[PDB]
Curated annotation (Swiss-Prot), chain C:
An annotated GO cellular component: viral capsid
Protein name as annotated: Portal protein
Subcellular location: Virion
Organism lineage: Viruses, Duplodnaviria, Heunggongvirae, Uroviricota, Caudoviricetes
Homology family: Belongs to the P23virus portal protein family.
Chief subcellular location: virion
Whole-protein coverage range: 26 to 224 of 448
Species this chain originates from: Thermus virus P23-45 (Thermus thermophilus phage P23-45)
Superkingdom in the source lineage: Viruses
Alphabetical UniProt keywords: Capsid protein, Viral capsid assembly, Viral genome packaging, Viral release from host cell, Virion
Function of the molecule: Forms the portal vertex of the capsid. This portal plays critical roles in head assembly, genome packaging, neck/tail attachment, and genome ejection. The portal protein multimerizes as a single ring-shaped homododecamer arranged around a central channel. Forms the portal vertex of the capsid. This portal plays critical roles in head assembly, genome packaging, neck/tail attachment, and genome ejection.
Quaternary structure and partners: Homododecamer. Interacts with the capsid protein. Interacts with the terminase large subunit; this interaction allows the packaging of viral DNA.
């Protein structure tokens, strides 16, 4: 074939424009709502748990093949990222987490790739600075619908400069997106939790207006028409009402014509607690997390056995896969190809598939193993032969690692 | 190096799950080894699809597209694309090339859910602060100082319920007695939410909707959501194996007649301790032999296929089709 | 490449200014609310549990490689910090915990690094004094958006001096931040618990 | 709360390793390029009785040998790292970086 004669079309319709139909959440005004939802206890709890569980995923660089060139470039980009926590490069890998959490909250976030020249003739990754989506006005596009460049206009901290219209190409940057439709349009993940949040705030204000009626009672007082405003009797009636509100122990002393009374609402206050728990359940359900981790399990039954995976486990796997896919598509080819033009299979970033299993089963298995080794004279070498003779899943379950990861990390 | 085309298939499939029909292009540049490399796959959102053309025998012919290039560059109109350059995904197709969406049954519960939320929002404003009423004599008309004073009394009863009410001996301030408690609409909300989650085909334990109903005792041979997630993977694999694979193999091998297939692994959460005890029995059998690893691997590949899968050791076929 | 031609931009918008949108929690008035929330039973209980569980984490210095130079400098900075509880250096490692808990409550806290000369020709870490964020007015910034120096104005205890406008460079200090956005702006962790506390 | 208390320790260790350590190593070693790192131990509350049964199997393996302790310690450091951490025996690296 010649090429792609079909452009990347918008997701727009007559009402729905760029994955959004609400005018309140249409442009950058939706970013205000997405930022104000960070003031929630439930939302910040779920985000702290999800992002902390992302940050402890036991990442490892996987090379292309068993060739020493692939292992060399894999250890190279491992030193560039610093999967082990600290290095001399001022920790760029957590800046990727910051850009990813901004792209999870807002839908699209980006960052720069600074490539100074190392002393060994290699292009060291110097630093990665984030780009907050408040500062991003638009993103440019190619004629085939794909993106072209990033238009920025923000404010340098300290009030130094008012940068305006700064256009940055993509090949110097990395762009993260949540639940992209393949068309380069990142919808935010906080989209479904907006109406429950708004109804939650309105319901809190309704409870604040209702308790002031049902707990002290609104006073009413009937006077004859002889008393008008600004008189001593008018000030006395003001004093009676203010003392009924503020100091309810001086009592009420009335002439034989005045009828002090509370306005009879003639109904008890309805229990709004189930509606609050319903909208809080709506928020935590829209975030995709179970009600046991975030403390919202209230009288509902615990999970009996569960499925093959859990809800929050599948959510936290699916986010790690999107993060690893975005890193492996955008950051890695901008690092390997300027230092190896002849590369064609990039080393990949993959987490370890964790599985909480019993240590006692591994202990009994290891006891059987040393029972097998016991009759032999030389214990450790024949033991390690029995260890690496095992299948891969049991060898992972014992906690012994292969030589590939220790050869890609320590050298 | 191919910029990850396989997740674009997932994006097209999820668009076809939501909307009923989605598609994408197949860009085939020429590789350096004389083979037609799959260069990229761009999605086609069903908002941009107006119609699909058809053959005279009822089968489809081409895809009619009219959308908007991002950045406001072009307004593409009536762009007709043949099928043999594309892939088309469908949910629950009737064999007649018509993809009904999967969100079809969850529409009326959703509409009733929204109307019920608006009814609760109109009902709480009545049952929690109470609508005020006030009777004045006919001497007071609109726009007077007494009329503004009555407005001020009602507005202070709504907004600042601590200044109190001070009335002349003729006015009767009152709340309108609805004479009934507010009915509990929470079961109706949970009913329509159960209708939505039941129409999606998922159990009430994964999505957090289990509210006072009993947990599953043993279950059946499979679960609800397990059968749903198997049945969707089978449709996705069938669509890939029918449309994408013959457009890749036949331009690079015209003499092919049995295409390689795409299949997932049938997962089965079993106990590791049973596999640990089995492996302990295996090394008990190997223990009397001198050379442990080669006779051990002979005992391993001498096993039946299900137990060999349960130990986690893979065959040479998958490692010979992946690593080379 | 040449370098970073893109400055560290603010998180500001027309209403949201520096990770905050409420005018009550906008400037140092939010620090008053963050300090008054320490009078809660729930908040002080959770902070005591979390900080006590941080202080018993079984920390260990991990060296760079198995080379004796890396092990030597690792044991050097281990003696500088004193991961084992006491030493002659008057316990600087718990001062780091104090600075970190101030940065957890308020969003940003800092401390000084005093480097006297040891008798063995090595720069011993002498002491670390905390800097409470009540005393911090502003932080200076480089032209590329990164921070430059710390502007301080507080009161010496005993009513001795009223220090004003004391500018301190960063390379003599350490700065802790909670949930930094990579742009050097530390939002506090007590942000979401404010409206429930007021209600 | 376990993920919260891990995520705070990681932020504290990252802040220490980025700001305090290079201001200590580089004024005393200008030729340094890989700083030593601060990391906590990943705790895991496991059963002591499983470790007791494992140690019983270990001394059953050592029992036929004449010299118990040296061959025992050879069997100990021949173990994988997770089980060796679970027995509570530490490596020589931490005791060589603390006590000297």
């Amino acid at each position: 074939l010649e090429g792609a004669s079909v452009p990347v079309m918008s997701t727009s319709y007559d009402v729905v424009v760029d994955r959004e139909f609400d005018e309140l959440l249409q442009g950058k005004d939706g970013l205000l709502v997405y930022h104000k939802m960070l003031s929630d206890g439930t939302v910040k709890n779920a985000l702290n748990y999800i992002f902390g569980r992302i940050r402890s995923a036991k990442w490892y660089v996987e090379p292309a093949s068993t060739d020493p060139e692939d292992i060399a470039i894999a250890a190279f980009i491992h030193a560039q990222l610093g999967i082990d926590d600290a290095s001399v490069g001022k920790y760029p890998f957590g800046r990727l987490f910051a850009i990813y959490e901004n792209a999870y909250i807002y839908g699209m976030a980006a960052g720069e790739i600074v490539l100074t020249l190392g002393a060994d003739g290699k292009l060291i990754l110097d630093k990665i600075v984030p780009i907050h989506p408040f500062n991003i006005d638009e993103v440019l596009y190619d004629e085939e619908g794909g993106p072209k460049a990033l238009k920025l206009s923000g404010e340098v901290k300290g009030g130094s400069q008012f940068v305006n219209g700064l256009e940055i190409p993509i090949w110097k940057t990395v762009v993260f997106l949540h639940n992209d439709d393949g068309s380069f349009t990142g919808q935010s993940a906080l989209r479904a939790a907006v109406p429950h949040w708004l109804a939650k705030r309105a319901l809190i204000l309704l409870i604040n207006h209702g308790l002031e009626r049902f707990m002290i009672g609104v006073p009413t007082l009937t006077i004859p028409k002889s008393v008008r405003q600004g008189t001593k009797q008018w000030e006395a009636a003001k004093e009676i009402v203010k003392n009924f509100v503020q100091k309810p122990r001086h009592g009420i002393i009335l002439p034989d014509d005045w009828k002090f009374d509370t306005v009879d609402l003639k109904s008890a206050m309805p229990d709004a607690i189930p509606y609050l728990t319903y909208h809080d359940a709506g928020i935590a359900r829209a975030l995709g997390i179970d009600f046991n981790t975030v403390q919202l399990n209230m009288g509902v039954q615990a999970v009996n056995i569960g499925e093959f995976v859990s809800l929050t486990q599948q959510t936290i796997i699916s986010l790690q896969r999107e993060f690893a896919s975005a890193v492996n598509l955008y950051l890695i080819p901008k690092l390997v190809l300027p230092n190896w033009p002849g590369a064609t299979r990039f080393p990949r970033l993959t987490f370890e598939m964790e599985e909480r299993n019993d240590f006692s089963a591994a202990a009994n298995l290891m006891g059987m193993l040393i029972n097998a080794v016991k009759d032999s004279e030389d214990i450790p070498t024949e033991l390690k032969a029995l260890i690496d003779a095992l299948p891969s899943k049991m060898r992972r379950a014992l906690g012994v690692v292969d030589e590939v990861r220790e050869a890609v990390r320590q050298p």
